[PDB]
Amino acid sequence: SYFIFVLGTAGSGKTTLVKALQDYLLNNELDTAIINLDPAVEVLPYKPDIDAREYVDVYDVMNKYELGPNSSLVISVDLLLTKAKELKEDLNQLQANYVLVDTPGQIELFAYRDTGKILSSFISEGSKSVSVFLFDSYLSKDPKSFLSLFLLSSSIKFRIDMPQISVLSKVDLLSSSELERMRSWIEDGSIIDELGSIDEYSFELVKTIVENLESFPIPVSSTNFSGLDQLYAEVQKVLA
Amino acid sequence: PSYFIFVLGTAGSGKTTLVKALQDYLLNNELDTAIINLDPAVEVLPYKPDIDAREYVDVYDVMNKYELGPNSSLVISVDLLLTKAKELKEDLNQLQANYVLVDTPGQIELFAYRDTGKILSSFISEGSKSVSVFLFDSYLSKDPKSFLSLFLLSSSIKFRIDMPQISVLSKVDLLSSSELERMRSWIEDGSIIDELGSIDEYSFELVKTIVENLESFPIPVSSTNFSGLDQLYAEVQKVLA
Ligand SMILES: Nc1nc2c(ncn2[C@@H]2O[C@H](COP(=O)(O)OP(=O)(O)O)[C@@H](O)[C@H]2O)c(=O)[nH]1
Ligand SMILES: Nc1nc2c(ncn2[C@@H]2O[C@H](COP(=O)(O)OP(=O)(O)O)[C@@H](O)[C@H]2O)c(=O)[nH]1
Ligand SMILES: [Mg+2]
Ligand SMILES: [Mg+2]
């Protein structure tokens, strides 16, 4: 069994990539299941084999405790730890070599809460796991926001202790010219010239990123169905 | 002379409680401070806000008007504050205070990594100096790897919210004196390198850059013990000068 964890900011394309990656993998004759760990997602574009909404009803939490949407979201994600026993039980009943794991919409509720570390380590126990972090192309158009995503993706890795592949998601929102500037920003280091006013600390952080980064984030577009061959190949290399 | 203090941090790291404690410290020193709450989904507030986002955007109205769930409604509700920005500054100018405490939404992601955050933060503090305060949750900081993840997160937020940022170690009453001293030596002396296990070269070079270039340890503050607020305000003043 192989576990692929899809991470990223809200609306960065996690859920859509899970459906698009599943279609690519099933088209290439690999049986993949999907676990949805978002107990508050309204509409899913795929058929999840395990649905967190079947374990924790965020609407039940709202009125049982008389809390608002924000508190209920935090409480609902935390309740997944109490339902982890059933989660791993339903894992063994699925027989697939690859398992895609869709995470809650807000990565903060997953990575920076103990539920994230425990659940991800508990369900991938005895299996190989890899995480995929989505760089929102819309956020990456600005060089400072682009660099903030690199620091964010590095932060998540320190919380979720598993290898992480970087993906530039929703890349169809970019022109060929926009990608070339973003590519040269990191591959050459020209983002230094277009960085505005920085403190020495943050400037030293950017220096470390550009000079020590091994590869650019994989440009993927779930709607154009592009980059999934590169993403799958990078997943394979990590899993070896 | 109006000063805006934006309080940031992970969910449950103590932003709202610190806003009350900071207001209490400033009022004890006879400094007229107002509070803006920008969280449209908070149930109970421990302070009395001069501007409340819940009076401009009703998150429950958004839920059934749009027929969406809590997650989507939260995102839309935070975004709707931009439609109410005209009214927002109108009620702000009615305040004459030297310090304006800004309480942000519970999830820092909904604020920092959404375009609403910078626009709101830049719009209401127009014509004034602003400083940001990022809360390091002490409970998360007990683990050396999670501690470092907070340093990378706080640095990421600074690249999104373009204003000076003061780092605070919040909820420090959850730590023993020994735990706090170990966390200080972890970063100030670099001994955290030894307590990192085996990590990739990229992450290791990032840790090195943090330890060797960090200017100061985060200010240990405890809102429940009402400690460290003298250090925070002094650092706020030094930045605002
Ligand atoms: N252009 C483009 N839009 C996308 C892509 N993937 C997702 N989206 C859109 O982005 C919005 C949010 O995506 P979603 O899958 O919900 O991201 P999530 O919240 O992280 O799970 C949806 O309305 C999608 O239509 C993509 O590859 N390209
Ligand atoms: N022990 C301790 N608990 C705190 C402190 N500040 C806040 N809390 C608790 O942390 C929880 C979340 O605090 P809150 O201010 O709402 O966090 P926020 O989401 O960032 O606004 C609350 O239950 C508080 O009681 C503190 O200084 N010490
Ligand atoms: Mg989703
Ligand atoms: Mg709060």
Numbering used by the authors:
A (entry chain C): 1 to 240
B (entry chain A): 0 to 240
Task: Give the text the authors published on this PDB structure.
In the archaeon Sulfolobus acidocaldarius, the GTPase Saci1281 (from hereon: SaGPN) represents the solitary GPN-loop GTPase. Structural analysis of the GTP- and GDP-bound states of the Sulfolobus acidocaldarius GPN enzyme (SaGPN) showed that this central GPN-loop GTPase adopts two distinct quaternary structures. The general structure of SaGPN involves 12 α-helices and a five-stranded, parallel β-sheet that is sandwiched by α6/α8 and α1/α12, respectively. The dimer interface emerges alongside the surface of helices α3, α5, α8, and α11, whereby α8 contributes substantially to the dimeric assembly due to its central position allowing the formation of a hydrophobic pocket.
